[PDB]
Amino acid sequence: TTTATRLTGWGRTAPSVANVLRTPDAEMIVKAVARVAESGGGRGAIARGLGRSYGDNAQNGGGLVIDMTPLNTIHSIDADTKLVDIDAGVNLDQLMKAALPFGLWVPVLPGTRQVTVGGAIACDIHGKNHHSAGSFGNHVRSMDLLTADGEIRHLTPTGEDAELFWATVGGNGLTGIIMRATIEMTPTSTAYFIADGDVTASLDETIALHSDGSEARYTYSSAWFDAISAPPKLGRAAVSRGRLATVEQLPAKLRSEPLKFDANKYTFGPIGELWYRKSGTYRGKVQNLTQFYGFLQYQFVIPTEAVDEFKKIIGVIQASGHYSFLNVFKLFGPRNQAPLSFPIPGWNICVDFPIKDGLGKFVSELDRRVLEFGGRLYTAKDSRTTAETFHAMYPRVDEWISVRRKVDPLRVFASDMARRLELL
Numbered sequence: 001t002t003t004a005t006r007l008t009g010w011g012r013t014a015p016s017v018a019n020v021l022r023t024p025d026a027e028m029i030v031k032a033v034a035r036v037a038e039s040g041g042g043r044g045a046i047a048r049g050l051g052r053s054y055g056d057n058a059q060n061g062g063g064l065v066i067d068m069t070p071l072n073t074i075h076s077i078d079a080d081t082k083l084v085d086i087d088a089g090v091n092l093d094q095l096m097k098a099a100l101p102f103g104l105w106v107p108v109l110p111g112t113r114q115v116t117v118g119g120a121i122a123c124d125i126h127g128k129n130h131h132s133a134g135s136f137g138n139h140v141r142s143m144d145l146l147t148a149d150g151e152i153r154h155l156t157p158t159g160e161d162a163e164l165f166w167a168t169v170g171g172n173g174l175t176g177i178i179m180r181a182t183i184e185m186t187p188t189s190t191a192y193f194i195a196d197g198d199v200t201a202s203l204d205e206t207i208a209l210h211s212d213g214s215e216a217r218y219t220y221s222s223a224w225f226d227a228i229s230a231p232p233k234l235g236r237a238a239v240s241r242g243r244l245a246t247v248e249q250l251p252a253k254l255r256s257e258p259l260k261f262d263a264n265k266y267t268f269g270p271i272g273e274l275w276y277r278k279s280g281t282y283r284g285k286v287q288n289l290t291q292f293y294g295f296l297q298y299q300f301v302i303p304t305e306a307v308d309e310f311k312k313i314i315g316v317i318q319a320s321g322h323y324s325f326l327n328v329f330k331l332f333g334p335r336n337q338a339p340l341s342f343p344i345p346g347w348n349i350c351v352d353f354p355i356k357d358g359l360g361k362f363v364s365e366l367d368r369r370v371l372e373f374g375g376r377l378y379t380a381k382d383s384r385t386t387a388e389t390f391h392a393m394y395p396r397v398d399e400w401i402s403v404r405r406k407v408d409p410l411r412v413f414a415s416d417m418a419r420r421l422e423l424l
């Protein structure tokens with residue numbers, strides 16, 4: 001039934017060997033669980049999706065890893081209720097293609113579409129529209145959770161069972177296996193964005209641009225971000241903000257099929273500085289999805305009010321010797337009821353660090369400042385933080401652990417991450 005396999009997160013670090021069940025039969029899955037809750041606890045069981053999480057939340061070395069990608073049935077889409085009803089194994093790319101013809105848009109998209117619905121919920125993923133749409137769990141209207149006791153619970157965000165619902169959202173698969181869910185989609189008349197591009201010269205004007213209230217005019221906003229140049233160049237950004245185009249705004253060629261889809265010498269001179277600023281500055285640019293959308297991935301958010309502390313963390317980063325080219329910055333909006341949900345209103349930033357000597361000790365310092373300044377790290381990007389740091393970052397973890405205690409008293413569900421962060 002099972003196959004012992006060598007599993008890594010997307011970052012390809014910290015491998016561990018687990019027995020991997022990979023069946024489309026919801027029965028075998030329910031039974032493989034009781035075949036684990038019968039032998040005491042052992043090393044338990046964790047669900048796995050498309051394995052895009054960099055962390056170790058979808059590994060369970062010496063235990064059972066259940067691959068959910070065979071469960072990829074889209075059961076129904078309804079354009080009137082905007083409800084979509086899918087198996088946890090369907091990915092967001094599959095789902096986006098199926099829903100477009102109904103005038104429905106996936107409400108939260110991450111930077112890769114090869115992500116299951118299970119994973120989208122379990123990490124409570126965010127995207128470029130967080131400040132307007134919240135994260136993924138805000139759009140889940142119901143889900144079917146295979147619990148440790150073998151029963152299948154129907155959860156909804158309100159009424160009774162809300163607590164277990166909101167613990168499963170961002171629960172990293174540690175309340176049990178999500179089998180099926182209903183998502184409320186976002187209505188759209190096209191598959192296109194209208195985008196305004198902006199460029200900044202300093203971290204100061206980047207913050208100002210995100211504080212002047214202009215942000216309330218776009219549903220989608222993010223930025224490429226300079227983490228290398230010394231001040232005051234440091235933290236200049238190419239800002240890309242937009243919203244879904246109506247049909248009226250499409251060029252005539254496209255207005256027929258609105259829901260479709262398919263380094264030089266100058267580069268560092270004053271001319272390319274002129275090129276980069278000119279090409280990064282635009283208005284009303286219509287773009288499709290793909291146009292608009294040995295390393296250590298590191299992402300954190302700092303509460304909105306601690307802006308000076310945010311600027312200081314950026315300073316620490318560029319003066320650290322560790323250089324990062326791909327940096328995305330965004331202002332998150334309001335959070336949700338999930339105790340372990342990563343997003344809070346404030347300054348979010350994703351950096352990519354070339355693995356080299358001293359990096360591990362340096363990021364441990366970074367952790368310390370992020371913690372100190374009231375922010376947190378993201379489990380879907382994280383493999384190396386500590387339980388003390390995690391627990392302090394997420395003050396509601398105790399609230400969460402209790403809920404999990406009820407629904408899995410015998411530690412049927414476990415992972416490399418749960419043991420490391422002491423969420424088990």
Ligand SMILES: Cc1cc2nc3c(=O)[nH]c(=O)nc-3n(C[C@H](O)[C@H](O)[C@H](O)COP(=O)(O)OP(=O)(O)OC[C@H]3O[C@@H](n4cnc5c(N)ncnc54)[C@H](O)[C@@H]3O)c2cc1C
Pocket residue numbers: 010046047048049050051052053054057058068088089109110111112114115116117118119120122123124125126127171172173174176177178179380381
């Ligand atoms: C290039 C790239 C860009 C990314 N951009 C973003 C981004 O912009 N925003 C963002 O939030 N994230 C981003 N991510 C991270 C990614 O969206 C999340 O880690 C996501 O959870 C991955 O989904 P998955 O299906 O691969 O799940 P996996 O990585 O296989 O599993 C992740 C977690 O979900 C749990 N899980 C999976 N299936 C189930 C289930 N059926 N029931 C219960 N639990 C389950 C697993 O146990 C594990 O804890 C990015 C990743 C990559 C590689």
Ligand SMILES: *[N+](=O)c1cc(C(F)(F)F)cc2c(=O)nc(N3[C@H](C)CCC[C@@H]3C)oc12
Pocket residue numbers: 110111112126127128129130221222299326327328329330348349350351
């Ligand atoms: N950071 O990794 C990050 C953050 C955000 C958001 F704005 F939502 F906060 C969005 C991201 C995105 O859309 N894509 C990516 N990637 C980075 C550069 C590393 C992995 C590749 C993708 C393109 O990151 C985002």
